[PDB]
């Protein structure tokens, strides 16, 4: 919102490119790939019989 209201020129940070923002602000090329991922704790490993 501080680039929309001309309060600054660029917004360097963890901004993700998406269609909603790119219609109101110009995004540079992605300098790192991100997205949506799910983080969970590891499950209890079970040793299969007949090993």
């Amino acid at each position: 919102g501080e680039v929309v209201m001309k309060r600054a020129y660029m917004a360097v940070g963890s901004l993700t490119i998406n269609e909603e923002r790119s219609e109101v602000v110009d995004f540079s090329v992605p300098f790192i790939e991100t997205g949506i991922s799910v983080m969970v704790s590891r499950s209890n490993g079970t040793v299969s019989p007949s090993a």
């Binding site: 490119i17 090329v29 992605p30 790939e33």
Partner: protein, 49 residues
């Protein structure tokens, strides 16, 4: 040269390329890797000797 108006192909976004043509947002985010031949374990008949 005007022969094609678009390049729908795996065109990586390069610095030298982007100077002359205008790219888009990527479809596939990927890098470069090395493809080798899997080491097939060959066995003879006297391997126990």
């Amino acid at each position: 040269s005007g022969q094609a108006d678009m390049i729908v192909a795996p065109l990586t976004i390069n610095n030298e390329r982007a100077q002359y043509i205008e790219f888009s947002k990527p479809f596939k985010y990927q890098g470069l890797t090395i493809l080798v031949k899997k080491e097939i374990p060959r066995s003879t008949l006297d391997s126990f000797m």
